[PDB]
Amino acid sequence: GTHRFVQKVEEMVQNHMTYSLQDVGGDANWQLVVEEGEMKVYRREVEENGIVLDPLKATHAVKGVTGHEVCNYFWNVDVRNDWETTIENFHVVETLADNAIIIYQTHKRVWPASQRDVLYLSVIRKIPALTENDPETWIVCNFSVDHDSAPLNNRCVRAKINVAMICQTLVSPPEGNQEISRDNILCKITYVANVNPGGWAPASVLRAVAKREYPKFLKRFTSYVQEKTAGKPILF
Ligand SMILES: CCCCCCCCCCCCCCCC(=O)N[C@@H](CO)C[C@@H](O)c1ccccc1
């Protein structure tokens, strides 16, 4: 629409559609560090000046939910505290459009160092399929920005993020007179997180925290979407 971040939003969605959906399984610069069920979590080891930046990428397949649903739930701030366990406080700093907000939040200490806070634009978008033979893609991008009404917090260190949750609904209609049900749909999810913790910590500790907290978030967040949509009509 007409807001000042539409160009940046476009570039991010684009970067993510081209570079983030890419296959990471046989990629030797990624290591698969967590596997649970349909979930796989990868990281690539990266540091710049002693600071761990490790790109992370998780794939998941979740039964009975659509991509539209998973992204709605991921994006929607009124349900955040139902699933998010790492947040201390947050608030919407601005509304840019009906699908784009800027959020400030403070995180619980996940290592014994200063709390980190973050200031990011969170946008939800549908990428149209090219044919009706492919899935439409829903994506939430969360990436850092600056705002007059949210400068640096004396106590907290400022993390910078570039995150995306990308989902696609696979449908598999039954052969007979039955109506399509939640049994017939599967959500493919790619979640990517590139975080700059904003200062130093021992790499072993930050890496053990990523390994612990990302899979805990995915399991709990996806399970939550499954619970909140069970029995309801399907939103594609
Ligand atoms: C960014 C601050 C780093 C220090 C706090 C967290 C350190 C690793 C914990 C990772 C937390 C996993 C759950 C994240 C779920 C998650 O994606 N949460 C979003 C909504 O609260 C913001 C999000 O797009 C994000 C992603 C990564 C880090 C911060 C915020």
Compute the residue count for the chain: 236
191 is in an annotated binding site: yes
104 marked as binding residue: no
Method: X-ray
Q: Could you tell me if the CB of 197 is within 6 A of ligand 1? A: yes
118 lines ligand 1 (CB under 6 A): yes
Closest Cα to residue 66, out of 196, 218, 200, 233?
233
- Report CA 136 to chain centroid distance, whole Å: 17
Specify the DSSP class assigned to residue 162. E
Q: Give the start-to-end residue ranges of the domains of the chain.
A: 1-236
Ligand 1 atom closest to residue 74's alpha carbon, by position in its atom list: 20
Distance 117 CA to ligand 1 centre (A): 10
Q: Is 163 helix (H, G, I), strand (E, B) or coil?
A: strand
Whole-angstrom distance, CA of residue 61 vs CA of residue 48: 33
- Separation between Cα atoms, residue 125 and residue 132, nearest integer Å: 18
CATH architecture of 1-236: 2-Layer Sandwich (3.30)
Resolution limit in angstroms?
Answer: 2.4
17 in helix, strand or coil?
helix
CA distance 41 to 60: 9
C-alpha span between 63 and 66 (Å, rounded): 8
Ligand 1 centroid–CA 217 distance in Å is: 9
Listed in sequence order, the DSSP H helices in the chain are 6-15, 67-75, 80-83, 203-229
Q: Quick check: CB of 21 below 6 Å from ligand 1?
A: no
DSSP H helices in 76-202: 80-83
Single-letter code of the amino acid located at 194: N
Strand partners, 189: 60, 167
Quick one: residue 128, left, alpha or beta (phi over 0 = left, psi -120 to 50 = alpha)?
beta
Instruction: Name the residue with the closest Cα to ligand 1, atom 1.
Output: 159
Quick one: angle between helices 67-75 and 203-229, nearest 10?
120
* 132 annotated as ligand-binding: no
Which positions ≥6 away from 71 have C-beta within 8 Å? 124, 138, 139, 140, 165, 167
What radius of gyration do the chain's Cα atoms show?
18
Beta-strand relationship, 157-158 and 116-127? parallel
Cα–Cα distance measured from residue 158 to residue 180, given in angstroms and rounded to the nearest whole number: 46
Contact present, 161 and 143 (Cβ < 8 Å): yes
Instruction: Output the CA angle 32-17-100, nearest 5 degrees.
Output: 110
| CA–CA distance, 12 with 121 (Å, rounded to integer) | 11
CA dihedral 77, 82, 85, 89 (to 10 degrees): 40
Q: Which residue type, as a one-letter code, is found at position 34?
A: V
Cα–Cα distance measured from residue 122 to residue 52, given in angstroms and rounded to the nearest whole number: 24
